[PDB]
Ligand binder design. Structure first.
Ligand code: NH8
Ligand code: FPP
Ligand code: ZN
Lengths: 401, 314
């Protein structure tokens, strides 16, 4: 019944060839900890039931959306993210955003918006591409005429241009660093608000492909190790610019699929590193992207009902190991809950239980049927309906200049 | 001067040399959202940072204040930006600043801002003298720190310090041959120095990799490296590899060896090989074994490879 509890699964435990290194030891430690969770039912003599704690997760989010303890002082420069993560989690849990909350969020992101374009981490903070991606996304989840108008489109385009580099990349912020995240953030906000000029992403697709390395995945900058966070940013950015073909899609596919842990069931962000609930999105989310990329390329072998990753196993890892009894989700057992992980663990679960390739549509919901979440768009990670709604709305206005 | 965690630390509203300035509290609007209930020390420091930022006061006390703001939230890029403004405007000793950032990175190595700041300093002083060594100490605490490896690659590329890096790679590979970051660094050094076209180097590299594989058959890093340096020109371009791998299959077997075999067959089936009939079956058999027994977690992927191989070699 449950993939992770079957006896054969025990064979998937790490084989260290009797050669111990920091990597094997740490992989073994986490595996031992995950095995405990898996066996706890046989141990306590209870029949296993995988239940997503909606009610608990809802209170956690509902409250965080309003106020947080000093434990989040370190996110004082990431408030638009907090809005996005929470609003999106509630969105996935299919919980409505009272119009009074929506307007306060809209008003708050307004204070965050810079006079010169983009959004900052909080009121009066300089603009930065990461919080700009978060705000636009947050505003789009709300999807009202009020939210949409918050975005100063002319200044946004202007800000995007101030970050563009000759080699095709973008700075995260003025006087800041550059990496593939900026490429995605820029492409994401520019596409949704329809401000893409003919030369805005000149050479971007090319710069991103330079980030794909020998492993098949994508690194932060050319020459860097392949990582799930940057790989999602790279491929997703390319899908927006309709240039996925610029990548060796086959080595990428082989790389991401190998990132799923044979034992844990979840994903790691880099080869020879530990599994982590948030990568249920960054890594597993790549599969829908490649599925679509290959299909538009005319691939005749693509499955008609599943993504190219073990959906059941990823749902089992998330449901058994990533929930906090108090509400919220996390990295792995032993780690503390946080909204970031709550947002991406749920996003990842959504992907794992929802397949769609044109006319075909097939679901897989492990545990109780109430576990099924709302679908999420693999490129923007907001509801497919919010995507369509926002793009349709911003196409009513012309591209600035 | 007065450490933020010192027993005699005093809030800024209680400091004589700050009586003239009125702090500027943060405006979260009338109906706050994701409102953080900051501690006393925190909002005191930022209320005054906001004051100094608005007035755009480029003073030494402002400079000292940014340090406290940074310590409370090293991720506040706005504060780091103002600090760099003061560094130049006040003409601060940059080596002194190098000492400072060295210390903060030691404390918080998994932070984007601290590394970017160091890069800006190294760029300003045009001095990479202490970089390779500083990074080695960080990497000594966390051998896989992404920021550290990215900084290392930057310093090496910009100042052309390649001469000793392959040796450093060998040192760390000996420490942990499973460190994927080191294998990446290995590929980084070789492709930017000699390259993988010099047959002597490709020879040396594949021999070393195969050697590490014999020692640790289940280390996916050695395998990914072998595949990455050979997939370029095509795996079927090297006829001896196929059977050589088949030689250690009864003993040094792993789902990693099985998969490489499949990778060698599909390149063969794509480059006009003898007995295409038999190879396509060999491939489809391995795919099945993987999807059903040896590597079931990737079953959907292996059934796809099986199908696609049929779709084009049936
Ligand atoms: C490696 N890793 C794997 N799981 C988590 C991590 C991060 O170390 C990590 C992830 C992404 C990036 C990038 N870029 C940098 C670090 C990480 C920890 C963490 C905790 C919270 N939290 O709420 O307590 C919020 C954020 C956060 C804040 C702002 C933006 C983003 C984003 N994106 C994430 C956190 O981020
Ligand atoms: C839109 C956007 C901002 C996307 C970025 C997503 C993302 C998850 C980036 C992570 C990059 C990073 C610094 C990883 C290494 O940290 P680590 O060593 O702690 O992680 P690891 O050990 O799991 O590799
Ligand atoms: Zn995580």
């Amino acid at each position: 019944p449950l993939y992770s509890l079957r006896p054969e699964h025990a064979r998937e435990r790490l084989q260290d060839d009797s050669v111990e290194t920091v990597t094997s030891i740490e992989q073994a430690k986490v595996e031992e900890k995950i095995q405990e969770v898996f066996s706890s039912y046989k141990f306590n003599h209870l029949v296993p039931r995988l239940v997503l704690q909606r009610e608990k997760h809802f209170h956690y989010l509902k409250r965080g959306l309003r106020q947080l303890t000093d434990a989040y002082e370190c996110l004082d420069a990431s408030r638009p993210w907090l809005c996005y993560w929470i609003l999106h989690s509630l969105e996935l849990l299919d919980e409505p955003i009272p119009q009074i909350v929506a307007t306060d969020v809209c008003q708050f992101l307004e204070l965050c918006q810079s006079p010169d374009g983009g959004f900052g981490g909080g009121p009066g903070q300089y603009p930065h591409l990461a919080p700009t991606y978060a705000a636009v996304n947050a505003l789009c989840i709300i999807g009202t005429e009020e939210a949409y108008n918050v975005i100063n489109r002319e200044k946004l385009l202007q800000y995007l241009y101030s970050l563009k580099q000759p080699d095709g990349s973008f700075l995260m912020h003025v006087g800041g660093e550059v990496d593939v995240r900026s490429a995605y953030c820029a492409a994401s906000v520019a596409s949704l608000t329809n401000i893409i000029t003919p030369d805005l992403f000149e050479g971007t697709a090319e710069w991103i492909a330079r980030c794909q390395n020998w492993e098949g995945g994508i690194g932060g900058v050319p020459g860097m190790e392949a990582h799930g966070g940057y790989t999602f940013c790279g491929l997703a950015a390319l899908v927006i610019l309709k240039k996925e073909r610029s990548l060796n899609l086959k080595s990428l596919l082989q790389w991401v699929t190998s990132r799923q842990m044979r034992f844990e069931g979840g994903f790691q962000g880099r080869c020879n590193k530990l599994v982590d609930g948030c990568y249920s999105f960054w890594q597993a989310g790549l599969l829908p992207l490649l599925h679509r990329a290959l299909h538009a390329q005319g691939d005749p072998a693509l499955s008609m009902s599943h993504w190219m990753f073990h959906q059941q196993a990823l749902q089992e890892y998330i449901l058994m190991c990533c929930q906090c009894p108090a509400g919220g989700l996390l990295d792995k057992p032993g780690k503390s809950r946080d909204f970031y992980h709550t947002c991406y663990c749920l996003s990842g679960l959504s992907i794992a239980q929802h397949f769609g390739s044109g006319a075909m549509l097939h679901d897989v919901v492990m545990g109780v049927p109430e576990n099924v979440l709302q679908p999420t768009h693999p490129v923007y990670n907001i509801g497919p309906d919010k995507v369509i709604q926002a793009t349709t709305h911003f196409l009513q206005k012309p591209v600035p200049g | 001067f007065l450490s933020l965690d010192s027993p005699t630390y005093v809030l800024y509203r209680d400091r004589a040399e700050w009586a003239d300035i009125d702090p500027v509290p943060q405006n979260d609007g009338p109906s706050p959202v994701v409102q953080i209930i900051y501690s006393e020390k925190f909002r005191d420091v930022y209320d005054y940072f906001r004051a100094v930022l608005q007035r755009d006061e480029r003073s030494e006390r402002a400079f000292k204040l940014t340090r406290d703001a940074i310590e409370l939230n090293a991720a506040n890029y706005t504060v780091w930006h103002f600090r760099r403004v003061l560094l130049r405007s006040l003409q601060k000793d940059l080596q002194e600043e190098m000492n400072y950032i060295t210390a903060i990175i030691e404390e918080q190595p998994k932070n984007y801002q601290v590394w970017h700041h160091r890069r800006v300093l190294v760029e300003w002083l045009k001095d990479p003298s202490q970089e390779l060594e500083f990074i080695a100490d960080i990497l000594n605490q966390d051998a896989k720190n992404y920021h550290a490896w990215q900084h290392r690659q930057w310093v090496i590329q910009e100042f052309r310090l390649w001469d000793n890096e392959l040796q450093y790679v060998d040192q760390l590979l000996k420490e942990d041959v499973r460190n994927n970051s080191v294998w990446n660094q290995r590929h980084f050094v070789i492709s930017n120095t000699t390259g993988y076209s010099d047959r002597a180097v490709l020879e040396r590299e594949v021999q070393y990799t195969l050697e590490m594989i014999k020692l640790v058959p289940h280390n996916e890093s050695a395998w990914n490296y072998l595949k990455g340096i050979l997939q370029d020109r095509g795996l079927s371009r090297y006829p001896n590899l196929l059977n050589q791998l088949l030689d250690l299959q009864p003993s040094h077997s792993s789902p990693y060896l099985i998969a490489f075999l499949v990778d060698i067959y599909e390149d063969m089936l794509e480059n006009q090989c003898d007995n295409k009939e038999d190879i396509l079956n060999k491939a489809l058999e391995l795919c099945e074994i993987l999807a059903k027994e040896k590597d079931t977690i990737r079953k959907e992927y292996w059934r796809y490879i099986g199908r696609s191989l049929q779709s084009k070699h049936s």
